[PDB]
Design a protein around this ligand. Structure first.
Ligand SMILES: Nc1nc(=O)c2ncn([C@@H]3O[C@@H]4COP(=O)(O)O[C@H]5[C@@H](O)[C@H](n6cnc7c(N)ncnc76)O[C@@H]5COP(=O)(O)O[C@@H]3[C@@H]4O)c2[nH]1
Lengths: 179, 180
């Protein structure tokens, strides 16, 4: 129930209007446009623990330092909720693929998940650590259900679920190859 | 409870770190500090319908067109969810009081409410308009409880509840004047 609202908010307040124009947005940067092996879809990071380092380069998920920040994308300006020209931008990362050419992709954590974690820590009485795990599952399936119902979001995103024990670089490299 | 999550997200993902220094953020702009009748607190707009025009100046809520966009504040930069330096800024508005001196304040709609509205329209089976009305109340009470439990957020915000039939300019002028 609570995860349901977070999934809808994640769509209506973000994904619905940032995914259809994600490809077009990236092309505005020469540094990004001239790039090969750059998948033009949002890789939504969904860790099972619901916690992450807001900074991915050299994060705990990236032990070998194969992931590197390539600068943000052109910020999308949109007026919403009385706030003029609110900024919607994404971070481009560089993933070393051994001796091969490095990979480039947009990586973002599912921000509603941070609410679930913070709730479990700040108010364990409303959301227990056990209850938190259940809502993550609901969130994923609900979000997937919503996005699958949006033709404009078709092939504009990739849900990357992984446990925090996994090497983010390894997990990412597989999905990057599978494209 | 869906409204509970929306309230917590509105806090943890926004209000918790934008409210305590909201005043200081405003002072960074020369045009704003020297301004009189300028309350340095976020007036969170909470319409009962949960729907609004994203542009308040000359909006449907502002018939007499007394509200005017006076520019945004210096954006607060913070890296969140793998996104480097997300921008968190607010819009300053000017409210005309007839021939008298105008008022200045930050006005924002409660963005989680738009989710409640959109849910009621897209999937009425999951969230009916009757259930939506109940969830707005829960959201409001929850949001108040959360903010009241944070002294850093004390007296740095103002919840402005109103029906979409009322004149936003009037309601705001009332709230601003009653706070002396
Ligand atoms: N008025 C206003 N100005 C803001 O800057 C702002 N930032 C957040 N919020 C509201 O706080 C709550 C929690 O924030 P969160 O990041 O976890 O979820 C966000 C986040 O997952 C995603 N999103 C929205 N804007 C951005 C953005 N600029 N960058 C990345 N992700 C974003 O979409 C969700 C819903 O956004 P909103 O529908 O605008 O309202 C949010 C939300 O209800 C804001 N409200």
């Amino acid at each position: 129930n609570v995860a349901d609202g977070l999934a809808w908010s994640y769509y209506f307040g973000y994904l619905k209007f940032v995914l259809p124009e994600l490809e077009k947005q990236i092309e505005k940067t020469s540094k990004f446009r001239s790039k090969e092996k750059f998948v033009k879809k949002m890789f939504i990071l969904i860790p099972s623990n619901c916690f992450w380092d807001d900074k991915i380069p050299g994060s705990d998920y990236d032990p070998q330092n194969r992931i590197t920040f390539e600068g943000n994308t052109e910020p999308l300006e949109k007026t919403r909720g009385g706030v003029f020209l609110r900024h919607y931008k994404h971070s481009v990362y560089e993933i070393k693929d051994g001796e091969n050419e490095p990979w480039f992709c947009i990586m973002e954590y599912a921000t509603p998940l941070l609410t679930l974690y913070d709730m479990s820590v700040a108010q364990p009485g409303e959301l227990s650590r056990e209850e938190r795990d259940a809502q993550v599952v609901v969130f994923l399936r609900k979000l997937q259900d919503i996005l699958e119902g949006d033709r404009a979001c078709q092939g504009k995103y990739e849900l990357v679920t992984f446990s925090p024990d996994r090497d983010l670089a390894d997990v990412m490299l597989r999905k990057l190859k599978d494209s």
